[PDB]
Design a protein around this nucleic acid. Sequence first.
RNA 1: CAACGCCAGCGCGGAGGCGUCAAAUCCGCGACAGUUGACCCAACGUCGCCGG
DNA 2: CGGCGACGTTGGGTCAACTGAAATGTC
DNA 3: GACATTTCTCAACAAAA
Length: 604
Amino acid sequence: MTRVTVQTAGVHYKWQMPDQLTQQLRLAHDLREDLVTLEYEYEDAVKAVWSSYPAVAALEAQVAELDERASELASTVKEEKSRQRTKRPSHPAVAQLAETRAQLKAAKASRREAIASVRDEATERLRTISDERYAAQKQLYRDYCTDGLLYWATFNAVLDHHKTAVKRIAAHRKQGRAAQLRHHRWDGTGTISVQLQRQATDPARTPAIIADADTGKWRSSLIVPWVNPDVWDTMDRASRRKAGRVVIRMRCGSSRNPDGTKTSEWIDVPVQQHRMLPADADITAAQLTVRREGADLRATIGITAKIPDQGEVDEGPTIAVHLGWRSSDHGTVVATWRSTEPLDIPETLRGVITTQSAERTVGSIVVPHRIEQRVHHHATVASHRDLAVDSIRDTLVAWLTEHGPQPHPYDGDPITAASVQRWKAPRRFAWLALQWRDTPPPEGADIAETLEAWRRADKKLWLESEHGRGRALRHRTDLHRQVAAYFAGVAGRIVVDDSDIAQIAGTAKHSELLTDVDRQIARRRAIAAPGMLRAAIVAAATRDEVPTTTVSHTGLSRVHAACGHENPADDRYLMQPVLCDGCGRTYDTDLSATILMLQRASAA
RNA sequence: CAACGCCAGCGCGGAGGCGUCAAAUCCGCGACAGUUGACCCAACGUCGCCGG
DNA sequence: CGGCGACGTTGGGTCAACTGAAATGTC
DNA sequence: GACATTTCTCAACAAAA
C-alpha cells in the first residue's frame, strides 16, 4: 500500500485516435498554458509588492546597475575568449568581471535579506495575491470543467502537476539557481487522466473489481480487462499476446450537444497488455499518454496501483556501484562494481557485466560499442536533413522572388520571400508542401513538385533518424535494467554514492580542457547515461526490498584507499592508473573508489 | 541490390512483408514504475573573431 | 583548416514531487 | 440514495543575458 507501481499497456498503432481524445489533449495543453500565464502574472504581482517598499527598490536599483556593468564586462570577456583561443581570456576584464560578479552577488543577497525582513509587514498583500491566483484557478476550472468539456480528472492531473512544478521552481530559486516556467508549442502529445475515488466504506479498487464491466463500482470511469497473474504467468508467450489484446474503456470527458449541453464521452482504446497487477493492488488512477517520435504518434495507457510490500531480505552480498563514463576498447565503462562475496554473472550478461579477475569480486559495466555507433548515425543523417532544408529554402526564396509574394492558403501571415528566408524549422517547409501539393499557386506546378519531393525525402530521413536513435537509446536502457535486475536479484545490499551527475554535466564548462574534448566527454556521458544506470539499480533494489545505502562522493576519486592520501586534482585522473603521492603506487581510481565506498557503507 | 526504419507495449533474435498519401502479421528470450516540469548538454545548419 | 563564440531547431540526460477523498448536488 | 462532480490552496528568496 506504500509501494506504487504503474502497469503500462500499449495502444494499438492502427487505432485512429478519435476526435474526442485529441480535443481532450488539446484542452489539457491549453489549460497548462493558461496556468503558466497565471503564474507569470502572479510573479509580476509579487515582484511589484516587494518593490513597493523603498528599501527593496533601492537595493534593486543597485542590483540593476551591477547587472549592466557585469553584462558589459561579460561581453568583453567573451570577445577576449574569441580573440585569444584560450577559454581563459587573461585580460584585465577577467578580474574586473570577477569582482563585479562578487559585488553583484552581495547586492542580491542584501536585497534578499531586506525582503525577508519586510515579509511580515506585507503578509496580508502576499496572501491576497495568492488568493487571487487560487480564485483564478477555480475560475479556470469552471471555464474548462463545469462548462468546458474537460474531464475533471484530466484537469486535476494537470493542475496538480503544475502546482508541484511551481513548488519545485520556488525551491530551486531558494537555493539561488535559475528556474522559471516556460511555454511549449502544441505537438499532438499529452496525457489524459481518470481518478478512481475510493471514499470511506468503499471496497478496494482491486483489478478484479475494475475488470468487472457490468457491476463494477467504477465502470463509468475505467474498465481494464484482467487475468489473475497466477493464471497469467503460466501460459505461453503467444497465448499472453492474444489474451492481452483487449479494449480499455476510459471516461474521456464531455462533448458539446447541438442544444448547447454536455454529453459524457468514453473511449475504447484497443491496447496490448503484457503483465497484470497483483490481485491485492488498489488501482489508484489511469492515464492515457500520447507521445511522439519522428512523425509517429504512439499511445500508452498506464494504470497506477498501490501494492503491498512483500517483505525485506537479508541474504546476499553487499555490492558497490561507482559511476563513470570512461571510454574503453569494448565500450563506455558506465560503472565499476565490487562485492563482498563472489558473483556468478549470467551468460546473457557476460559482455555487459565484466569481471576483472577469477576472484570475480570486482568488475565493471560496459555499454556496447554498437549503441554508440547507432546513436552517431543520427548526427550523420541530421547533417543531410539540414543541408536539404537549406537547399529547399534557397529554391523557395528564388521562386518567390521570381514570381512575387504569394497569398497564404489560409495562414494569417502571408508567405513571402522574406518570411521563407527567415524560416528555420523543417516544420514550415513540410506545412507549405502539404498545403501546395493539392492547390499549387499561380504558375506553382514546378515549385509544388519540388516541395513535395523534398517533403517525402525529409520525412523518410526524419523517421529513420529519430526511430534509429530512439531504438538505440531504449536498447541502452534495456541493458541498464538487465544489470539493475541482476544486482537487485543477488545483492543483499547495494552501495551507491550521491554524486549529482546533473552538476557534473553543468560544471563541465569549467573543465580547464579544450571545449571539443569537453563535448566529446559530455556526448559520451549522455550516450552511456550513468545516472540512468544508478537510478535503475536503486529502483530495482527498492522494488525487491533490497537495502540501499548512499555514501558521500567526497574524495572517492582523489583518495587512494591503500595510501589513505588525497591526491591533488592534477594527478592525471583522466588517464588510468593514477599515481598516488603518499606511496608512489600506480593505483586504479575506480577500484579504490569502490573500496572506499564499501568501507564508508559498512562504517554507516 | 543492399543498409536503415515501420509492421499489437519495450529491447534483443529469427521468418514473412511495407518504403510513409504504405504495410501484415507471426515466433523465442529478457526486462519493465510511470507522468510531469525545471535545468543542463549534445547534434546539426549558418555565421563571426583569431591563429597556421 | 583548427581554437573560441553567436544565432535557431530538435531531442535527450538528470533529478525529484507524486500517484486523494470529503462534501455536495443531482437523477 | 447511489453516483458523479466540485473542492481543497502555505510560502519569499532565480541566472546570465
